[PDB]
Write a protein that binds this ligand. Structure first.
Ligand SMILES: CC(C)(COP(=O)([O-])OP(=O)([O-])OC[C@H]1O[C@@H](n2cnc3c(N)ncnc32)[C@H](O)[C@@H]1OP(=O)([O-])[O-])[C@@H](O)C(=O)NCCC(=O)NCCSC(=O)C[C@@](C)(O)CC(=O)[O-]
Ligand SMILES: CC(C)(COP(=O)([O-])OP(=O)([O-])OC[C@H]1O[C@@H](n2cnc3c(N)ncnc32)[C@H](O)[C@@H]1OP(=O)([O-])[O-])[C@@H](O)C(=O)NCCC(=O)NCCSC(=O)C[C@@](C)(O)CC(=O)[O-]
Ligand SMILES: CC(C)(COP(=O)([O-])OP(=O)([O-])OC[C@H]1O[C@@H](n2cnc3c(N)ncnc32)[C@H](O)[C@@H]1OP(=O)([O-])[O-])[C@@H](O)C(=O)NCCC(=O)NCCSC(=O)C[C@@](C)(O)CC(=O)[O-]
Ligand SMILES: CC(C)(COP(=O)([O-])OP(=O)([O-])OC[C@H]1O[C@@H](n2cnc3c(N)ncnc32)[C@H](O)[C@@H]1OP(=O)([O-])[O-])[C@@H](O)C(=O)NCCC(=O)NCCSC(=O)C[C@@](C)(O)CC(=O)[O-]
Lengths: 413, 407, 405, 405
């Protein structure tokens, strides 16, 4: 019926009461209650009346979903989950292997197009890829009394011993923290330090923050007058467009290529190698340059990154820098009727452990590509492998869309 | 029809009927996906990989033929809620589909500071989706002529006529042209009701390019999209000219609220905003990213509300500014300007029911009958508002030395 | 007056006179300069380091109070000539004030290929100098309101009237506004006859900002220039929106001419242009610099013709493109598009006689009485033309493996 | 030797290239004197070079080194600003310009600094760069070369080759960048007191050869694939630096700001942020967070024989202003310039008048004892003077003193 005061289980009815009582704040329901799902039920209830159209929540799934794995490190105020259609494209004949690429999307033709692109590649002898570099970064802003002081610190960080003490501090942070280079940049009395380190099969944004922080402390011991303004002074750079990610790289840098047989271009892609190339240059090069792009000399690399990212538990917001990509197309073969295509992506921020990678459905798409979890034997291998697949699939998508654009097929589909 | 499950399998195999064909071949969407999963498993190095990828009893009737191909199931993204967001004297319960811990918590904490601050105000500065095809002429002198033509009032009128005759909402605004030798990049800009409009615009520019061709028969239409729109790629033009909805946001957090809720000082916030979001971003050579994590907020809301999560690229453009304010300058004045929010309230993933749930939750869902475009615009303002909230909280945490404490 | 350099210096050393005023006193420019050199030598660690800095017999008359302060002589810059430049069915002998060897030789070699190629064609795509002040309002909602106001036809009309009432040539074109919170950046665009117009425009935006103030009394005019013009700084907005004169250029070099004059192959040129001026520039994160050395050509012509050599920054923006052309695709099609050539044929260094010499040499000097702006525009085209010429030659040299040696 | 009208006809007939005139006439000046007559016919107005100087210049130092087809020289007013109290020294900075108030303003700025205890500067890095484009059959090959160049031994053989090129060629790091089967290699080396554009090209070329020995299938497309980057705007110069990177700072006493600069520290700062930061960002600038660093670079560059076209990358500069002092009434100002391409030897640095302005700053020629010192010292002066000019113009803008001066 109704009651009052904390006790045993109680009822949705008035457990709500104690929330108004302001002793059980909304987001703490899982703290108190016994079953995660009840918690979400009660919140959807609270939130329900907070709503203008309370009948909304009705078609928002939530029932039976392992929440023990989200509550804790993947989301707060869980009021359910969002279903994203997951299509599959492939096989992707990449580096003498075939992958069935999962793509969580809501945009029609994206999967169809990526597939059509994978096809051209398969009938083309397949594609080759190489991870050019690997390292997640973090660039805090630090301050000194005078620019002359910043200057001194910069020089110090650049001496071999100085770098060694910073590296030691940094690496003592984790099992995988192994500080590579150190890129410093001065702005008056400000000093931006770009820390770069590998991180096994983790995307490493977290590991690196812990590492730079410990390093900044040891750095402070030497320059007590230094102010650590913010672990992140946008010099990483994370989730924001930045020429530095494009030029210096961030995460995994990777190249991709394939040669599509003139026949395959006419048959599968429905155009000409000559037409493709004529479009790639004036679109992905001259066009992008005209729009003042930094890092976006590609057709829709983003569409492919986001889809794979959502499907495989990556940070869909890193879609920003991860999509950097220049796609190039040349005439090739004995008659120059064959299409040579490459795709270079300098900043693929990706990981195979932690984050959304810990959820089971996302993990399903990872296993589907045989990348899931940490690579015990060779640490970082899964992350790297996935990076290559992302780059490979992007080339596939680039191939198909570019073709469609050349052929005048975009409006039809 | 009935044929044993594996009977369809073998059948397809022996015919080599492309899996994607299924939906048409088989009766009932869930069969075709269940069968596809089945075919796929045998192509995998661990046939039981999809053991945890849901797919059962989902509404594929909407999806197939409109949102995704080769469906093999669906991906569950935790959906949190933040708010109320006291924006323009209203309160919104903002849904955020994410997998990053603290994002919702932080956006909430940010919304809180704003609520106890008298709320936030926002304005949509401009509205217009764009499409910029590449077109070619024999000589640059010809491109030149076309450019001048498109710039005459009559020339623009015939192009506009053609363009607008494309849809009920297609109303071509300006026309930005740009020459590269014999190449001509034409940026078409038009409103589009409550639709994000990427599709409507393509239809419009295409019809317009035809009418344009009638006048310059020697013109080659190389591609409806010559990257001058620009869509899903970083571009100074979206930042400077705007794309989609441009919107400003502001709020003033009372010094007490900054010390109590945000756990810092207005002075500290400002010292960080300038050297991070301004000097830092400039040092990294950013174009459009003078903000802390506008992207985190856009993506979350975008995924939760059926938007194109890949447009996260240009939609996240945002400059966040913080000034000292009040009688004592202890209050925090904060603003966030986002010039290119590509958003829509109709079509796309906006047609799926669960996404529609999050849209109703903000009372934006579907087309706005009375005032077309209103929902799209309203949602844009909410995205900008929530972004400011997130900016507030994260900036604070950074000032206070809390990122490696919260996470 | 007439005393003695020997003592006209003491008063000065009695600080009764600031070196930078000798002019006001000692009426006879060269003497003013003369005394100042002497007074400076003493302050120098090497009292005679100015031994070789010319100064005599230069017409400081026009310089003083309009081009330079604290004058102490002049700097001689070698002036070479390149051409003829067969541009738009005309031939120009282009003057280039430079100190870099081969620049003139190369630009010439480039002009040559063009002459034996049927010549080059050019078009001025747009014309308008800009000024973008920063203005402030109490709240962003206020900025917003002003933006919308400036965008209404009547609002623009009152702003335009105010702006145009500033000068005989001030004819405000569009108005590009941009909001940053409670800040509002207004880009004013207007023609300006044959003047580069940086000054004319400032005067115009200022009068306009006043009338704007009358309507929004709560608006703070922070600075007539809030870097949204943008002047003398790299900016995507100049590249995308244009600034000054925007112009295209093209020519087709006959395969024979490429092999003979330029010493390479159209195929090789093209292979280099794409991977250097496009893919390379993109790799370096360039905004506006998809060209080989457009700057070398702009600066030289700018110094020789009295332009603002510092505007070399935005004026050099240029994308140079090369395609295969002809019945056999062995001919080289080349184009050069420069969106922001800040140039003028009147005022500034354009008032000095030696610079004016180089202007007449191109028949552009002074204002074009009949068709105002024509000289400025014509010169802009020549700058673009000569740039293509230089692009042609250097690209070739690079293709052929000739830079070093 | 004999006669003029004759050399002409003789020329016109056997039609000799005007540019060869120097190798057929006893004195240079009669070469350029003939050249000039010879060109006058070819003008719409034969009497155009009337006022264009030429006599008694000493083309000797120019011929075959600084300029071709010389028809004379261009006089650029040279003003002086200072003293510049930089690093406990005072410099009298020469500025070759044609823009009124530039010198006056830079002076006024130097003044505020002098009465402020002076300015401090530091050279953060030194290295000229060259980035050729090289090609391989497949991207996998490019990839392999990149990794090779990154191994310590691979770098050692490349460095050896590179350094064996000159006495000052000492290859620092190596920044590589892949674009499919393309490979952009950024070579970085010091170069004494030379700007080093030439030395580096010779070095990368020698290195690219040795590189070829290891990857015979590699195509050297161009010694310069715009990844240096030279004379074009590029985020890489801004982020990685090019030439000399230097910081500058000073603190102007609140009194001095009100008295000399005619404003408030609070006003200055309010303008710097919304103009040089927020404004520049709104215009989509990469590298230009400053008011007019270019004006100062160009002037000093022309006066001291530097490459005025490098004005493009050399002008990169972010200027910052904070409140300082016991009451925060004092103005703290800094200026960071990451890519000052400068040199004190070779180029226009070999001409005597330019050398005059170099001595004036006591930088002229190579620094025997400490190689590179002069180049570096001049770089610091350029950065110092830029801060000075930033100070004055920013002030003027804050105070609303522009249009009228
Ligand atoms: C629609 C297609 C794929 C047809 O392509 P098609 O060649 O005309 O159709 P087809 O039946 O003749 O070819 C068959 C092949 O297509 C594929 N295919 C065909 N249908 C399906 C399907 N249902 N499901 C899966 N795969 C499919 C499949 O791989 C198949 O191979 P096969 O079965 O013979 O072994 C093509 O025309 C295309 O790729 N169009 C463009 C797609 C695209 O651009 N997608 C992204 C959205 S565009 C956007 O919003 C970004 C943009 C444009 O703004 C960016 C920019 O500015 O550039
Ligand atoms: C974690 C907080 C929010 C704690 O916040 P707090 O103030 O330290 O502790 P609190 O308990 O006093 O705060 C409680 C209030 O915060 C919110 N809040 C608190 N806990 C919860 C919860 N469980 N669920 C929901 N809401 C929560 C909520 O609104 C609540 O209001 P109340 O009811 O108490 O008046 C804070 O420390 C914070 O915001 N940290 C930063 C979080 C963040 O920004 N993370 C994601 C972005 S990091 C990134 O990847 C981007 C980066 C850094 O790489 C980009 C760059 O800068 O380069
Ligand atoms: C050196 C040349 C011109 C030889 O040119 P050549 O074709 O090798 O020899 P040639 O004598 O047979 O050519 C003669 C023609 O060239 C011209 N020419 C030839 N000599 C002269 C002269 N003395 N004075 C005037 N004009 C001359 C002239 O027009 C003549 O026509 P002709 O009289 O026979 O009918 C050629 O090899 C060349 O162009 N070299 C490269 C020039 C160049 O581009 N350098 C300046 C930029 S380098 C820099 O600092 C920027 C950079 C490159 O680093 C930026 C980047 O890419 O990152
Ligand atoms: C005009 C001034 C200098 C007057 O300065 P003032 O303080 O108004 O008047 P003052 O006579 O009392 O000042 C005297 C002091 O100024 C200097 N000074 C004064 N006159 C001279 C002179 N003739 N020659 C040399 N030095 C002079 C000198 O140092 C002297 O110190 P003192 O000897 O008294 O101890 C000042 O108002 C000013 O600096 N104006 C602005 C100058 C300027 O910056 N213009 C060039 C940039 S405009 C442009 O094209 C770039 C732009 C606008 O586009 C950049 C952007 O986009 O932001």
């Amino acid at each position: 019926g109704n009651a009052e005061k904390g006790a045993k289980f109680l009822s949705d009815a008035e457990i709500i009461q104690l929330v108004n009582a302001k002793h059980i704040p909304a987001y703490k329901l899982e703290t108190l209650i016994e079953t995660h799902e009840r918690g979400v039920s009660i919140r959807r209830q609270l939130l329900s009346k907070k709503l203008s159209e309370p009948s909304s929540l009705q078609y928002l799934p939530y029932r039976d979903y392992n929440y023990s794995l989200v509550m804790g490190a993947c989301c707060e105020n869980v009021i359910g989950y969002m279903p994203i259609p997951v299509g599959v494209a492939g096989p992707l004949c990449l580096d003498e292997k075939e992958f069935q690429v999962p793509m969580a999307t809501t945009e029609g033709c994206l999967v169809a197009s990526t597939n059509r692109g994978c096809r051209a590649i398969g009938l083309g002898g397949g594609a080759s890829s190489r991870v050019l570099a690997d390292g997640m970064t973090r660039g805090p802003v630090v301050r000194l009394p005078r620019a002359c002081d910043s200057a001194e610190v910069k020089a110090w960080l650049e001496t071999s011993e100085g770098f060694a003490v910073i590296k030691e501090a940094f690496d003592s942070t984790s099992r995988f923290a192994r500080l590579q280079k150190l890129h410093t940049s001065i702005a008056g009395r400000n000093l931006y330090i770009r820390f770069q380190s590998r991180s096994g099969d983790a995307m490493g944004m977290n590991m690196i923050s812990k590492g730079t922080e410990k390093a900044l402390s040891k750095l402070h011991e030497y320059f007590p007058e230094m102010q650590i303004l913010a672990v992140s002074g946008n010099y990483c750079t994370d989730k924001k467009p930045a020429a530095i990610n494009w030029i210096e790289g961030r995460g995994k840098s990777v190249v991709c290529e394939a040669v599509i047989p003139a026949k395959v271009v006419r048959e599968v892609l429905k155009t000409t190698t000559e037409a493709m190339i004529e479009v790639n240059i004036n679109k992905n090069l001259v066009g992008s340059a005209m729009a003042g792009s930094i890092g976006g000399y590609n057709a829709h690399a983003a569409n492919i990154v986001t889809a794979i990212y959502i499907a495989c538990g990556q940070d869909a917001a890193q879609n920003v820098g991860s999509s950097n990509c220049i796609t190039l197309m040349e005439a090739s073969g004995p008659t120059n009727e064959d299409l040579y295509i490459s795709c270079t992506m300098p900043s693929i921020e990706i990981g195979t452990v932690g984050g959304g990678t810990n959820l089971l459905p996302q993990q399903a798409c990872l296993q589907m590509l045989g990348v899931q979890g940490a690579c015990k034997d060779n640490p970082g291998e899964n992350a790297r492998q996935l990076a290559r697949i992302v780059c490979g699939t992007v080339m596939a998508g680039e191939l198909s869309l570019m073709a469609a654009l050349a052929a005048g097929h975009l409006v039809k589909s």
